[model samples]
Target: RRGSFVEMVDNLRGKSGQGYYVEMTVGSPPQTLNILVDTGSSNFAVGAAPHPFLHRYYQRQLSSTYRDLRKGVYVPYTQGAWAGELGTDLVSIPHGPNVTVRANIAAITESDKFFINGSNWEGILGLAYAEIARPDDSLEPFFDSLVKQTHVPNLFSLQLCGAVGGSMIIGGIDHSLYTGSLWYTPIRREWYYEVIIVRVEINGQDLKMDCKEYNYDKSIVDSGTTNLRLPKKVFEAAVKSIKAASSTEKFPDGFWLGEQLVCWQAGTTPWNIFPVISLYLMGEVTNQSFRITILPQQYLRPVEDVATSQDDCYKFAISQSSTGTVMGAVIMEGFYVVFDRARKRIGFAVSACHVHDEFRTAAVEGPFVTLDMEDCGYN
Candidate 1:
């Protein structure tokens, strides 16, 4: 895992909740579009045809470097879904790594809920491994394309932020962006930036559950998702344990269920009433673990710039995942995360922005010894 660090990178501009998208010129003449960053999906999709909701679309004819494959493409996430045709075009990030690739992108014609609310982005770009690409491995991910062409190191770092948005470094870490040294965990598999979970701790008390259950179906880190999504049982147990640590008010079950939004009158501080939640992840060393904590401010998503009534309403940022635990924005914004593909590991350091509450709101600590931990990626 040792090598000279290359600072080659790009800046991502967008809120953590709305979507972290980057301005990339797609095609020859280069039609500008903000593409959403998704680590879970490997297909890069753009509005090719026409959609009433979309402000603009990527016109194939407009781009001289564009080519199409008769093949069709479709992708669905934890919530929204999109379907389209596959094509290749000149894609470049002006504010990103200084290279362009004739990458495969989907000419999206049909989609649902993917572009409806806070639709600042015109496209969705996936940085995951090709194993999960829409059709096959022939279609490599944008990140891989960058690595192969640039010959830069096969690693990338991401830092999701609050209302201010965040950044994704294409091939290196900006040491100034994070505090302290990076904490790395073995990548459970080549797909979806997979990682293992050992336990969920409420405050300092570890939630008692079979360790294997934490990695049920293989947990992953997906920036495409909005919140800290957990398996049904894990989600339920987490809430049950949270109830004991929460102070003052008895919140409705729907709040914990994520079925409803729990709001406090404007100006009243409710963050202090909730317990700090920590997710135990398998460490780079065998049987050792590390945890990324979620502060009340992160999970209790403040409605907007500020909230009151419908305005200041805060919603529960924890949801149920159908496949497995998908750590998203709420859990991500806490650290500057590096996806070290070459080494098959993921690194996390306290983000410079989230340093205010490092030891207070929560913390990132690990290499702690543990027992009963199994083959984290046997599945």
Candidate 2:
């Protein structure tokens, strides 16, 4: 059984956006905890804030297997930061009669200044590379430890089903989870599952990037982020192209509500009127390429009410970032992604949900496969 495991992720609606979570038991007595499954960062931390439900917080006094490392950990993010004490204990996931990992390093938050309120998940489980793990002592993430200790395959597949919830398969791929072919690409950087973007097209029209340096065009496939983030110049050009193509009106600075970056009048189907954005990426070793198409329906989402329902607007889900482009959940919802650390590659295929196709078994081992864009229906 290769020690492979599959677990269902919990879909939670937060104050800001939607997030996916998984349940795990920590400590000797096995205190259940809900953790946000983040592919963008690597740090397993639990909340210290007192909750009416005592099990929500990590109780060091109760776990007989807990060992305090006595080192302070400072985890900072773009929005917030967390400081805590580093420790090790037994951690378990309910997969095929349950797999238990010992000496799993994690953080017990002493203080939190960044997490949003009203969120069901009290902690985060980083699934990215170990390079970006904890800065204190650089602990191996739970999944990394699981693969090494259990002799499991170093691969995990994420199938995010919007708000309905989905599943994450650890140690190998589930052929029945996706359709067509799995398009594999080399990860330029291990820190953030970074990949190269050959070019971007709006409605089949190529939009030139301001920076000619290939490095600046790189993007990180991040599931932690809710919106697609593009560099300032690239974002501006994309918005311009969308406006010109859809003839949608923009709301003045102070007139827009909530996180509405670009919006059109109510009662309009932007997907039916706007052009789809196509992002082409290159493979590191195979030298192959694949396209990730962002249909208007996927990007043009309904915005929350600002003044009244009558004045509601449909906003483009893309945002502008000061640094590199980030392929976040908004764009990822359209495909099935495999974080293949064993091969240092990322795999993508049209999600079975989108095509209404049934999941079928496929080989989980061996060399990566390449497909012709035209034959794969990606063109």
Identify the candidate with maximal lDDT: 1
Query: Model 1: which ten-residue window has the lowest total lDDT?
Result: 1-10
Per-model TM-score on C-alpha atoms: 0.92, 0.81
lDDT of 1 by residue, 1-379 (tens): 3323333233676765777888889887769988888888898889887777777889998788888888998788767888899888888887777788878888998898788566578898898889998878788888887787786678878888773767777767778677777888888778688888887788889888786777788788888787888778888888887888884788887887767776665666556767888888878776788887878878877655452343467788888887888888767888889999999999988887782342475468876887656654436
Query: What lDDT is obtained when candidate 1 is compared to the true structure?
Result: 0.79
Q: What lDDT would each prediction earn against the true structure?
A: 0.79, 0.65
For model 2, how does the per-residue alpha-carbon lDDT over 1-379 read when each residue is reduced to its tens digit? 1223323332222311445667767887778777777888888787755744324677777999989888778888766677888888888755412467774455655553555454567778888878888773358776777786787678878777652566677767766667777877778767778877666778779886532332354568887787788777777788778777776644453322224455446644334566778777665545356677777656655555576654545555788777578888767777778999888889988775442212221111223233432231111
Which residue pairs does candidate 2 place in steric collision? 176-359, 176-360
Q: For candidate 2, what's the RMSD?
A: 6.5
Q: How far is 56's C-alpha from truth in model 2 (Å)?
A: 2.0
**Residue 193 shift from truth in candidate 2, angstroms:** 1.0
